[PDB]
Homo-oligomer: A and B are copies of this chain.
Amino acid sequence: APESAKEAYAWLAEKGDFGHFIGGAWTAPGDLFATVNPATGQTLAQVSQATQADVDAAVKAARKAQPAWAKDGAARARVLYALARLLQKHARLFAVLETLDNGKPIREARDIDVPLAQRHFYHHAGYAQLMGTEMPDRAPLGVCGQVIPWNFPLLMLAWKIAPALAMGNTVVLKPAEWTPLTALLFADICGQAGVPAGVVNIVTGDGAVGEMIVTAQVDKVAFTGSTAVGRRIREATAGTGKALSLELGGKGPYVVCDDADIDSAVEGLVDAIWFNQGQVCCAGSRLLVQEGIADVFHAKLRARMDSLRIGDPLDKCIDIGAMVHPDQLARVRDMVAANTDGEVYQTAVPAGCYYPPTLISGLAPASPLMQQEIFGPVLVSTTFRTPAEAVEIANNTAYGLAASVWSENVNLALDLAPKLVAGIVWINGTNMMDAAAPFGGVRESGFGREGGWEGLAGYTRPAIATKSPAAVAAYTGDGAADGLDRTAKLYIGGKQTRPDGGYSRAVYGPKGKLLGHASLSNRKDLRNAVEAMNAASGWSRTTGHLRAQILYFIGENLSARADEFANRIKDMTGKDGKAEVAASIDRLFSAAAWADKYDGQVKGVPLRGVALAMKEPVGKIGILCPDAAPLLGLVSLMAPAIAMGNRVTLAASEAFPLAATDFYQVLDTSDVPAGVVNILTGAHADLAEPMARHLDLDAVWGLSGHAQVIEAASAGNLKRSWTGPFDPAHDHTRDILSHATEVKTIWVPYG
């Protein structure tokens, strides 16, 4: 007997045609479109396509409510707790509504989706309670515009709304046009939970409504969905000062070693087939099996796939539900129709909006199917010989979200996990989720983390704001020739190099005295710098102890030249440079201090084992330094970045480049490995877009302006970007460590 939907139908009948939830109240239904039960084809309800006026009103109401909401963290905790209790009290209603609207089996909705949504609100209540005392340097961002996809409608909502509210923000959230109903029921319980009017606003519609929210007067945009829409959102928000997080999917590799627990690995994969759909953090869709066990693994997998029950999603015995929409069914059919590689196995399928579990095996590591987005309940598989080859195959995509590794050997499992490019690695499991355990992407899977203490920073800003110094025009001078050799070069790959373009500009002091010449770098110089950083990839695998020693040497060797650097700064700016040099030394010693002390965090989880939220390098960072603070600006950005294991290329102060060029000798004397620090001089108008666009850079920090160009160009490979504020007089070290690291959460067995 299937689960009863009587209560869900009664709620839908009560709500009638839906408007929006704005300012604590339901608005009149407008331009209606149907949401259809994909398993039956029946219209469940009519919902409104929001207008620009609706989105304006939602954001206005969220803004009006936010300062009172931000004031009392203890009060927010009570509301978040109440929301969790109402999710639990109405768990069966939320679960049936999710199954009706999305097509997923009721057993998944009841066992996975709703309990994790409850736990997300229970857990994040405590962050609201603790924000004032445990995050005293932080404050709410304001209003968050939030946009989510169709695959896990309620749980995606929880992942967005719970941290935003905990940190004193208000939200305007739009569910996917195919799956609006559980978000509307969430709206309908907000009053009962004591959510103050306008703290939560839910508007419905398709991508055009998403676009309105993204471009509205919000302080943050948080998006989960397709990579292409992620790029458009990054472009649409460029130069606006909005905070942005993007979780962009990319189905993860599932690595099965010769010594894996085969039957547990098979059962984990078959139990993940329905789950691994849409843009969710998951692993299993890309199967990588060591060649010694590959035939046996595949044979067992196909028979376990046969045991999956496909049919009525309201039947609690069903494992494979209905596809979310005919458009998605067509997408999966078309993907399979376009593939000619490998051997395709499909289980039986019932008639209608159902697609069967499908395994495409015998693929080569270079096959396009191993690299393209995979749609539907479809697995693709290839083999590997060595663990090193498994790592190479797993990392040979544009994505980097989650991964799974199966091995019974204590060494092999924990050796492979840090080598995989991913935000999450599950050992001997997959799709393990908890509110305390952060998740999110790298590369074209996006940026930002959701869950844990780590997920909170992106919903906050400094309690005391800094402001970047104004740009400073370079001084001019008469232009008489220079009989001495005072033309500074570039510093790339451990040695000084001429600028590829051959040009240098005269540098003058405040009264017109010629001080020297500085190179004008170009895109070919930047390319050479990126190649040097690629050759220095070993730096990102060094010990913190080693990196600390190098930074200590840089600090010592700068100190030995302190008077000289102060005189150079005074020559260029007319103002005494001793305080700036002392601060630069201090930043180096603070970065040296941190190099082996920026600890990952161990999460107790109510699941098997523990989650290790590790700190890893971002990788290769291009940095543009402000005009002011010709030494301190450069050192303040360089030092925490390399302390965390990054390689960097810095565009030094455009106005005052000669302190940075004097610094080349310090880098050489300090035995900084070739390519770990590279320095370009010249016009940031020449360099900003090339650095932000570069597809082989992992992050761009633009602290000299050009924020719109930099943030728009960063969409090419979706690198992380930071455009300030950055005040070199302020000690930003701790904040910069966060810009300079990624969180990778490794889930390990633990008694």
Contact = CB atoms under 8 A, between A and B. Distances in A.
A607 B748 CA distance: 20
Contact of A609 (B407, B414, B605): B414
Contacts of A599: 453, 601-604, 613
Interface in A116-143: 119, 122-123, 125-127, 129-130, 133-134
Query: Quick one: which of A78, A126, A615 has the most chain B CB within 10 A?
Result: A126
A97 interface: no
A594 B130 contact: yes
Contacts of A418: 750-751
A161 B614 CA distance: 30
Contacts of A751: 414-419
Contacts of A427: 410
A686 interface: no
Interface in A547-565: 548-549, 552
A601 B604 contact: no
Interface string A50-88: 000000000000000000000000100110010000000
A81 B552 contact: yes
Query: How many A residues are at the interface, by size bracket?
Result: 35 or more
B600 A130 contact: no
Contacts of A409: 408-410
Contact of A597 (B126, B610, B612, B613): B126
Contacts of A548: 122-123, 126
Nearest to A123: B596
Given A410-B749, A453-B597, A129 B415 contact: no
A351 B119 CA distance: 69
Contacts of A592: 126, 129
30 contacts: A77-B589, A78-B589, A123-B548, A123-B596, A123-B597, A126-B593, A129-B589, A129-B590, A129-B592, A129-B593, A130-B593, A133-B731, A134-B734, A410-B410, A410-B413, A410-B428, A411-B428, A415-B751, A416-B751, A417-B750, A417-B751, A436-B597, A453-B597, A599-B603, A599-B613, A600-B601, A600-B610, A601-B602, A602-B614, A610-B612
Given A410-B413, A599-B602, 4 more contacts: A126-B594, A127-B597, A414-B750, A601-B602
Interface of A: 74, 77-78, 81, 119, 122-123, 125-127, 129-130, 133-134, 407-411, 413-419, 427-428, 436, 453, 543-546, 548-549, 552, 586, 589-590, 592-597, 599-606, 609-610, 612-615, 731, 734, 748-751
